[PDB]
Amino acid sequence: CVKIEEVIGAGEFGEVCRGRLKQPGRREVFVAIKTLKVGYTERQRRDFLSEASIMGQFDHPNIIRLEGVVTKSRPVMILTEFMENCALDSFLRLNDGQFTVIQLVGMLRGIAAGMKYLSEMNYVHRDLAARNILVNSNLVCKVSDFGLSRFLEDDPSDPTYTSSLGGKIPIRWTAPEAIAYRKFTSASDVWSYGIVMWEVMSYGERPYWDMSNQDVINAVEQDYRLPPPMDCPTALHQLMLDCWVRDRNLRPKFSQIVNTLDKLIRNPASLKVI
Numbered sequence: 001c002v003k004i005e006e007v008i009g010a011g012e013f014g015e016v017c018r019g020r021l022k023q024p025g026r027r028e029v030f031v032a033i034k035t036l037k038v039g040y041t042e043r044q045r046r047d048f049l050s051e052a053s054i055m056g057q058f059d060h061p062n063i064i065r066l067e068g069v070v071t072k073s074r075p076v077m078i079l080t081e082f083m084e085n086c087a088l089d090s091f092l093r094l095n096d097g098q099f100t101v102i103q104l105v106g107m108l109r110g111i112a113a114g115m116k117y118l119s120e121m122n123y124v125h126r127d128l129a130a131r132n133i134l135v136n137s138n139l140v141c142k143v144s145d146f147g148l149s150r151f152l153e154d155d156p157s158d159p160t161y162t163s164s165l166g167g168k169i170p171i172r173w174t175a176p177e178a179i180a181y182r183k184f185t186s187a188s189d190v191w192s193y194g195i196v197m198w199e200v201m202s203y204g205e206r207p208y209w210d211m212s213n214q215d216v217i218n219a220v221e222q223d224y225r226l227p228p229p230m231d232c233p234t235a236l237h238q239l240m241l242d243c244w245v246r247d248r249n250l251r252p253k254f255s256q257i258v259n260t261l262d263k264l265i266r267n268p269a270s271l272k273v274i
């Protein structure tokens with residue numbers, strides 16, 4: 001059924017590799033295979049498999065699909081569909097200025113559609129960032145998690161994640177109430193989405209640049225907000241500003257985000273105003 005082709009990276013419970021899957025009756029496809037490390041503990045086997053149960057609960061075109069889970073043979077495997085263009089952040093950094101605005105709004109509409117599905121089921125992601133968005137050959141963007149351990153680290157002195165009692169926290173992507181009081185809701189994912197919008201419109205620039213993680217929290221509290229990226233339509237920036245309102249009750253819902261993006265797609269002339 002499954003054959004590993006090449007080790008593409010490492011995960012927190014073992015290795016992550018590219019391979020092939022032969023379904024009985026269906027055509028052979030390229031898949032991503034997660035393996036459990038040799039000499040694993042009772043907790044590690046439970047934690048690795050529980051992450052498959054979370055992913056296995058979702059069926060949507062903009063959410064990474066779980067093909068199957070191997071449990072009979074040791075080491076155990078998690079099998080998901082292959083995403084040829086890899087992580088959205090690196091993909092945009094390599095393809096700088098190569099897409100029209102319509103194509104970028106299309107990428108954003110998919111992420112928003114995927115996040116709307118998650119919000120319906122009262123699922124809070126807690127780590128929505130372009131680094132956790134996977135892209136396929138048809139440029140379809142999918143909300144991911146529990147993937148590669150490695151990620152882009154622009155400056156280890158202002159790391160992407162800061163350790164917290166409950167969990168790791170990505171300062172630049174997290175809502176100020178989430179940072180301050182661990183108030184993680186679908187409204188704090190909306191703040192993260194706004195950050196993702198800015199990542200997509202800037203072709204993978206670092207949110208807040210040179211500013212330290214502490215300077216970000218302070219600037220945000222003093223009502224600073226990221227400026228519009230170069231040649232970004234005003235409507236999109238205004239949408240990012242709605243996502244970044246301090247009052248979390250005024251931020252749009254993911255269904256409202258989808259509707260605004262569909263409205264901009266229906267009237268493409270509106271996207272000329274910069």
Ligand SMILES: *CC(=O)Nc1ccc2c(Nc3ccccc3)ncnc2c1
Binds near residue numbers: 008033034148
């Ligand atoms: C270029 C590159 O590294 N491409 C990748 C990386 C990761 C990945 C994954 N990750 C994943 C997420 C959750 C569970 C298991 C694996 N899936 C699909 N394609 C890729 C491509």
